[PDB]
Amino acid sequence: GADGVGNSSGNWHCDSTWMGDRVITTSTRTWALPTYNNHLYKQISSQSGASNDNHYFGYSTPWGYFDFNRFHCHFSPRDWQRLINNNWGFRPKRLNFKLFNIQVKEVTQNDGTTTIANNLTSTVQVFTDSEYQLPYVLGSAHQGCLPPFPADVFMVPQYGYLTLNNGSQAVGRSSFYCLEYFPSQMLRTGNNFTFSYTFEDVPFHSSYAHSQSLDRLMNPLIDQYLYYLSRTNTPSGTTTQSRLQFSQAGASDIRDQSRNWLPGPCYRQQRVSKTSADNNNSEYSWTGATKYHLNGRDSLVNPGPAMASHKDDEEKFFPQSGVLIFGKQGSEKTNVDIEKVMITDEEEIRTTNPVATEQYGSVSTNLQRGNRQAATADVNTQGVLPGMVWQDRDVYLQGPIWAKIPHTDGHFHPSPLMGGFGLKHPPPQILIKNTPVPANPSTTFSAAKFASFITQYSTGQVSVEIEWELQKENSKRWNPEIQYTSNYNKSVNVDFTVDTNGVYSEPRPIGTRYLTRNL
């Protein structure tokens, strides 16, 4: 840091600049940090009797952490539109981080009034691990983001983690991390903190949608030179006999043509409808779910593999867990009606990824003979096969930007299943805490742990700046594209704006896929 109590440690920077090829964004927010857990660590675990699936064991810490991982932190609704309408892809490159204008307040709750005053000599300490030595919590899509709207103020969320358990009990291999055991940087009023970071090379995210379905790749005018088996028998006299005929596949045969490629893999979902009348009356929620089984307990696959949500001309149906779901403004935690949630749509991927609610295809179950008749069965789960292409899941406007790839001997197509960018060395976790200030010890000496501290909290401003790389488009498409538009009719409230009471709200999910490409 630098200088005094009266001097300011940083300016407010929130802006976006568009350079053409690479583009830069900036934002600044205001935060407040409480003391958590009365300055002490605690182990936490599952509560008494619980399902074998719900057991957990871990620790909670006094430390907080910053999360900018959602897009809406970085991009405004309009800045989001020089991106998704005008471009075929984007990726991050490098970022900056800064804290400044730190001030610490102590509070006195005596009687029915609470007085608050500056504590000028108190400190707040911050570090960034950057060696990836801690359990990495970010990327699990928790709350506690920097707000989407720059004028809002937010608390910093508390930090904690989980470790191997057996039931509600720990195992010998289970690990315990003390955050005090790292070098950090102690800051007072008039001290600031910075670091900078560089993304590893990662593929552009695909903001295009395809103009060709994988099942139609070819010229309708010209027939193939390959033959397929067409008729298996022919009438002879009164009744048929076995005769094999072959054919070349034309535009009337398009079903039957040879191809060089296959659709992507599927792991199948249950289908439900937004119209309440079509759905069965029972509780199938947990029973009818698709799950995976790991170490004797069952977990839902909430996003699951990337698959189209519905087929043509059914907009009413979506996979049970297969989609992301966002809440509207002020929605509650539990048991809330469908009118409150916002359900995203995965469609444009129909052309490669198969629909999530249907089988991959059909396969032959048996060997035919004279007295046996051919039999097939549906394959509801398919792994990856050579010659198989697919697309990934869209990032939308608000959702995960990145995730940390687990450190393991093998992995396949690491792009993460919620969306965004898989990173082996992602942006490091930033951790922050209030330094404990003891209160009025006894006159005689005693060896005991202090239970008594001054009650205080801190606040300041944080800033983030990321540099993005863009991919422009050369398209010879003659006719116009599909663009993201706001409706021009009159309305009581404007979208993406404060209401009369001053609560900013986001009307609908906005994906990145509009501009079209050929497959």
Ligand X SMILES: Nc1ncnc2c1ncn2[C@H]1C[C@H](O)[C@@H](COP(=O)(O)O)O1
On the 0-12 / 13-18 / 19+ scale of CB atoms within 10 A, 415 is middle
According to CB under 8 A, which one of 154, 197, 267, 457 is a site residue for a copy of itself? 267
Q: Answer with the entry of a copy of itself, ligand X, none that 400 interacts with (C-beta below 5 to 8 A by kind).
A: a copy of itself
244 binds, among ligand X, a copy of itself, none (CB under 5 to 8 A by kind): a copy of itself
Q: What does 220-240 look like in DSSP terms, one character per residue?
A: SSS--S-EEE--SEEEETTEE
Please identify, using beta-carbon distances, which residue of 42 and 411 lies nearer to ligand X: 411
Least CB distance to ligand X at residue 306 (A) = 12
Nearer to a copy of itself, 8 or 203 (CB): 203
449 contacts a copy of itself (rule: CB under 8 A): no
71's tokens: 């897009």
Figure out which of the listed residues 111, 121, 407, 492 binds a copy of itself, where binding follows CB under 8 A: 407
Report what 3 binds from ligand X, a copy of itself, none; CB cut-off 5-8 Å by kind.
none
Of 167 and 414, nearer to ligand X (C-beta) is: 414
Residue 190 interacts with, from ligand X, a copy of itself, none (CB under 5-8 Å by kind)? none
**421 belongs to the binding site for ligand X (CB under 6 A):** yes
Specify the DSSP class assigned to residue 435. P
Question: What is the footprint of ligand X within residues 196-215 (CB under 6 A)?
Answer: 202-203
- Exposure string of 357-387, with b = 16+ CB inside 10 Å and e = fewer, is bbbbeeeeeeeeeeeeeeeeeeeeebeeeee
Among 22, 297, 316, 508, binds a copy of itself (CB under 8 A): 297
Smallest gap from residue 190 Cβ to a copy of itself (A): 22
Q: How far is the CB of 386 from ligand X (least distance, A)?
A: 8
Contact between 390 and a copy of itself per CB under 8 A: yes
For 158, residues 6+ apart whose C-beta sits below 8 A from its C-beta are 36, 37, 60, 61, 63, 64
Binding flags for a copy of itself, 359-388, as an x/- string (CB under 8 A): xxxxxxx-xxxxxxxxxxx-xxxxxxxxxx
Between the alpha carbon of residue 63 and those of residues 47, 135, 142, the distances in Å are 23, 14, 16
Indicate the residue among 231 and 508 with the shorter CB distance to a copy of itself: 231
User: For residue 227, what are the contacts with CB-CB under 8 A and spacing of at least 6?
Assistant: 246, 247, 248
Please identify, among the stretches 14-22, 110-118, 264-272, 412-420, the one whose residues bind ligand X according to the rule CB under 6 A. Answer: 412-420
Task: Kindly indicate which of the ranges 42-50, 81-89, 409-417, 451-459 contains the residues binding ligand X, using the contact rule CB under 6 A.
Answer: 409-417
Looking up tokens 């983001």 gives 145
Radius of gyration of the chain (CA): 29
Q: Does the footprint of ligand X cover residue 413 (CB under 6 A)? A: yes
Rounded Cα–Cα distance for residues 118 and 122 (Å) = 9
CA distance 518 to 267: 27
The least CB distance from residue 31 to ligand X, in Å, is 30
- At 418, which amino acid appears? M
Closest of 469, 476, 489 to residue 202, by C-alpha = 469
Interface with ligand X, residue 406, by CB under 6 A: no
43 forms part of the interface with a copy of itself (CB under 8 A): no
Q: Which of residues 51-80 bind a copy of itself (CB under 8 A)?
A: 51, 53-54, 56, 58, 60, 76-78, 80
* Cα–Cα distance for residue pair 258/322, rounded to 1 Å: 31
CB atoms within 10 A of CB 444: 5
- Nearer to ligand X among residue 413 and residue 449 (C-beta): 413
Binding mask 499-518 for a copy of itself (x = CB under 8 A): -----------------xxx
Tell me which residues in 91-130 interact with a copy of itself (CB under 8 A). none
How far is residue 152's CA from residue 367's CA, in Å, rounded to a whole number? 68
Q: What residue type is assigned to position 300 of the chain?
A: L
Q: Which among 440, 445, 403 is positioned nearest to 423, based on CA atoms?
A: 403
User: Which among 111, 195, 161, 181 is positioned nearest to 428, based on CA atoms?
Assistant: 195
- State in angstroms the smallest separation of the CB of 98 from a copy of itself: 24
Closest by CA to 293, choosing from 285, 301, 303, 302, is 301
Binding partner at 421 among a copy of itself, ligand X, none, C-beta below 5 to 8 Å by kind: ligand X
- Asked if 90 is part of the footprint of ligand X (rule: CB under 6 A), the reply reads no
Q: Which of 27, 87, 290, 461 binds a copy of itself (CB under 8 A)?
A: 290
Which of a copy of itself, ligand X, none has residue 177 at its interface (CB below 5 to 8 Å by kind)? Answer: a copy of itself
Choose the contact partner of 202 out of ligand X, a copy of itself, none; CB within 5 to 8 A by kind: ligand X
Q: Which is nearer to a copy of itself, 2 or 277 (CB)?
A: 277
Residue 411: both structure tokens together = 């992995």
373 CB contacts (<8 Å, ≥6 apart)? none
> Residue 468's beta-bridge partner residues?
23, 92
Of 3 and 215, the one with the shorter C-beta distance to a copy of itself is 215
The interface with a copy of itself within residues 206-245 (CB under 8 A) comprises 206, 209-233, 240-245
For the CB of residue 451, give the shortest distance to a copy of itself in the complex, in Å.
13
Q: Are strands 421-423 and 402-404 parallel, antiparallel or unpaired?
A: parallel
Is residue 399 left, alpha or beta, with left meaning phi > 0 and alpha meaning psi from -120 to 50?
A: left
**Residue ranges binding ligand X (CB under 6 A):** 202-203, 410, 413-415, 421-422
